């Protein structure tokens, strides 16, 4: 008596969830609206904790990760570094050791392609944009209606459909503000410079490592790419205005626009912006902070990843939080699968809803904390006090909070989460 899951969204979280479920004998379909891959060329990095979670989902996921990234001596340790970007002192302010392979980086689209190759053929169906969800009785299948006029029927539905999730809209009502992300009043300029130019502006040490330059109402992060031949720039600035509804969240911008937000900053940082191409990109940062989900699941429908808890990217770990979701959901549905073998339709479908209730109970606090924490650390990166020389010691005390919040992300006890999830599932079943 086999259990079928309809995953809406074939991004990194939906495909990782599919891989975990299928390796456990669960019948999975992934419905993706797009015709192929997106985010061509972008990099991302995963904490060691998230990588262990990937291994538990399916060790082949980690093989795919390590196939999708990058001499003797010793093993390198991964550091985060903060630098004063406003004053000419330009002095190193803080650093955090994450350890050997404390982060593992890849090219996003290459990783996603390698993951699709891990799945059995046919799991992912493209050009399948969810339009409407039709729920009947718990003992009946959930029907998914796509924009192309087709339908699919599954025992349960997972929304892995990202920041503008259609599954979320179904749950809360397409007119509810809770169904939609909102603007964080910050946007980012993104572009590259050559490593040669990066060294001119910053020196070899900074040019070849990851650094965040803090200051008043803005901040800049850079790190090397393409085999240390270029350096990727992200400059985040404050925007007092609204982002107009239906104005695209990505648009073209000029080097000189970015330069103007950093005119009072120190020269090395200004030089970095000066070395970017004339034409760069502007990215609005939206999230689920203002109207956080009242629940991640209801009935036989569950949200995971950015659909549940899209965050602004100031911890660099939003996907890591989604991989935790995918592990939790996978372990739960496999327990539904084994524990209801031989039982009636009524019992199996009650078990699905019981497991999804446990998922919500176990994940929602950490996930929504993380969304709050991503805004908070950005505020600390951007303190107005960084410019006020009468307040550079209160400003510099933020770093103990940054450490504690980072460690809370990086040192997650996922085995306790899974234990708590199984016990809450069993409790919800009257045991």
Ligand X SMILES: Cc1cc2nc3c(=O)[nH]c(=O)nc-3n(C[C@H](O)[C@H](O)[C@H](O)COP(=O)(O)OP(=O)(O)OC[C@H]3O[C@@H](n4cnc5c(N)ncnc54)[C@H](O)[C@@H]3O)c2cc1C
Report the interface residues with Cl ion, using CB under 5 A.
313, 318
**Strand duo 156-159 + 301-303: pairing:** parallel
Q: Choosing among ligand X, Cl ion, a second copy, none, which partner's interface includes residue 63 (Cβ < 5 to 8 Å by kind)?
A: a second copy
Supply angle C-alpha 285, 227, 85, rounded to 5: 45
Write out the binding residues for a second copy, residues 4-33 only, by CB under 8 A. Answer: 20, 23-25
Q: Choosing among ligand X, Cl ion, a second copy, none, which partner's interface includes residue 162 (Cβ < 5 to 8 Å by kind)?
A: ligand X
CB 159 within 8 A of CB 301: yes
Stretch of 30-38, 235-243, 246-254, 423-431 lying at the interface with a second copy (CB under 8 A): 423-431
State in angstroms the smallest separation of the CB of 104 from ligand X: 10
Residue in 86, 183, 223, 381 annotated catalytic: 223
d(CA 303, CA 364): 10
CB 28 within 8 A of CB 21: yes
60 in a labelled binding site: no
Residue 223 a catalytic site member: yes
CB 224 within 8 A of CB 230: yes
Q: At what angle do helices 48-57 and 12-22 cross, to 10 degrees?
A: 40
Residue in 166, 190, 376, 405 annotated catalytic: 190
Write out the binding residues for a second copy, residues 32-91 only, by CB under 8 A. Answer: 55-60, 62-63, 66-67, 71-75
Cα dihedral sign, 138-140-141-147: negative
Q: Which of 238, 204, 206, 232 is nearest to 219 (CA)?
A: 238
Output 65 or 354, the one with its CB closest to ligand X: 65
Output 191 or 313, the one with its CB closest to Cl ion: 313
CB 261 within 8 A of CB 269: no
Tokens of 278: 């004339």
State in angstroms the smallest separation of the CB of 123 from ligand X: 14
State in angstroms the smallest separation of the CB of 122 from a second copy: 17
Q: Choosing among ligand X, a second copy, Cl ion, none, which partner's interface includes residue 298 (Cβ < 5 to 8 Å by kind)?
A: none
Q: What Cα–Cα distance (Å) separates residue 285 from each residue in 151, 241, 331?
A: 34, 13, 32
Does residue 344 touch a second copy according to CB under 8 A? yes
Does residue 2 touch a second copy according to CB under 8 A? no
State in angstroms the smallest separation of the CB of 53 from a second copy: 12
State in angstroms the smallest separation of the CB of 228 from a second copy: 14
CB 220 within 8 A of CB 382: no
38 in a labelled binding site: no
Does residue 199 touch a second copy according to CB under 8 A? no
Q: Output the DSSP codes for 397-424.
A: THHHHHHHHHHHHHT--HHHHHHHHHHH
CB 325 within 8 A of CB 304: yes
- Going by C-beta distance under 8 Å and a sequence separation of 6 or more, which residues neighbour residue 116? 10, 15, 124
Does residue 342 touch a second copy according to CB under 8 A? yes
Tokens of 33: 């609206």
**Strand duo 142-146 + 151-154: pairing:** antiparallel
Does residue 180 touch a second copy according to CB under 8 A? no
Output 57 or 319, the one with its CB closest to a second copy: 57
335 in a labelled binding site: no
Q: Choosing among ligand X, a second copy, Cl ion, none, which partner's interface includes residue 58 (Cβ < 5 to 8 Å by kind)?
A: a second copy
Output 6 or 316, the one with its CB closest to Cl ion: 316
Stretch of 37-45, 245-253, 268-276, 334-342 lying at the interface with a second copy (CB under 8 A): 334-342
145 in a labelled binding site: no
Q: Choosing among ligand X, a second copy, Cl ion, none, which partner's interface includes residue 66 (Cβ < 5 to 8 Å by kind)?
A: a second copy
Output 181 or 425, the one with its CB closest to ligand X: 181
Residue number closest to Cl ion, CB atom = 318
Residue 190 a catalytic site member: yes
As for the chain, the residues directly before each break of C–N over 2.5 Å are 70
Binding site for ligand X (CB under 6 A): 8-14, 31-34, 44-46, 129-130, 160-163, 166, 305-307, 313, 316-320, 322
| Helix segments in 306-344, DSSP class H | 306-309, 318-339
d(CA 214, CA 222): 12
**Strand duo 218-225 + 279-287: pairing:** unpaired
Q: Which of 120, 137, 131, 149 is nearest to 30 (CA)?
A: 120
239 in a labelled binding site: no
**Could you give the residue numbers annotated as active site?**
190, 223
By the criterion CB under 8 A, which residues form the site for a second copy? 20, 23-25, 55-60, 62-63, 66-67, 71-75, 100-101, 334, 338-339, 341-344, 347, 415, 426, 430-431
Q: Which residues are annotated as a binding site for FAD?
A: 32, 45, 108, 306, 319
């Amino acid at each position: 008596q086999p259990l079928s899951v309809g995953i809406v969204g074939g991004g990194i979280i939906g495909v990782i969830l599919a891989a975990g479920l299928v390796r456990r004998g669960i019948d999975v379909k992934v419905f993706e609206q797009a015709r192929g891959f997106r985010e061509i060329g972008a990099g991302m990095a995963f904490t060691a904790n998230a990588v262990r979670c990937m291994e538990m989902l399916d060790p082949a996921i980690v093989w795919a990760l390590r196939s999708s990234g990058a001499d003797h001596q010793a093993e390198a340790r991964d550091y985060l570094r903060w630098v004063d970007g406003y004053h000419e002192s330009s002095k190193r302010l803080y650093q955090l050791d994450a350890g050997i392979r404390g982060f593992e980086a890849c090219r996003r689209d290459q990783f996603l392609e390698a993951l699709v190759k891990v799945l059995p053929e046919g799991i992912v169906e493209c050009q399948k944009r969810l339009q409407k969800i039709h729920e009947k009785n718990e003992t009946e299948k959930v029907t998914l209606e796509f924009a192309d006029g087709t339908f699919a029927h599954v025992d349960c539905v997972i929304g892995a459909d990202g920041i503008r999730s259609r599954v979320r809209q179904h749950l809360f009502g397409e007119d509810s503000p809770y169904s939609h992300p909102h603007y964080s009043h910050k946007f980012a300029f993104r572009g590259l410079i050559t490593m040669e130019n990066a060294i001119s502006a910053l020196g070899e040490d900074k040019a070849r490592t990851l650094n965040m330059h803090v200051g008043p109402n803005a901040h800049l992060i850079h790190y090397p790419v393409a085999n240390e031949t270029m350096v990727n720039i992200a400059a985040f600035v404050s925007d007092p205005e609204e982002w107009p509804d239906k104005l695209s969240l990505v648009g073209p911008a000029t080097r000189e626009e970015a330069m103007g937000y950093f005119a009072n900053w120190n020269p090395g940082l200004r030089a970095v912006l000066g070395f970017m191409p004339e034409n760069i990109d502007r990215w609005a940062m939206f999230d689920t902070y203002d109207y956080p989900a009242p629940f991640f699941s209801r009935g036989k429908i569950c949200l995971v990843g950015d659909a549940a808890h899209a965050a602004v990217p100031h911890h660099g770990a939003g996907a890591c939080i989604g991989i935790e979701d995918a592990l939790c959901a996978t372990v739960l549905l496999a327990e539904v699968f084994v524990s209801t073998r031989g039982k009636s339709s009524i019992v199996r479908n009650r078990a699905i809803a019981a497991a999804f209730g446990s998922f919500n109970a176990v994940r929602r606090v950490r996930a929504q904390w993380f969304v709050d924490s991503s805004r908070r650390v950005c505020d600390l990166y951007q303190q107005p006090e960084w410019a006020d020389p009468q307040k550079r010691i209160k400003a510099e005390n933020c770093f103990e909070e940054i450490k504690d919040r980072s460690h809370k992300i990086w040192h997650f006890d996922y085995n306790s989460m899974l234990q708590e999830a199984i016990e809450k599932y069993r409790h919800n079943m009257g045991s």
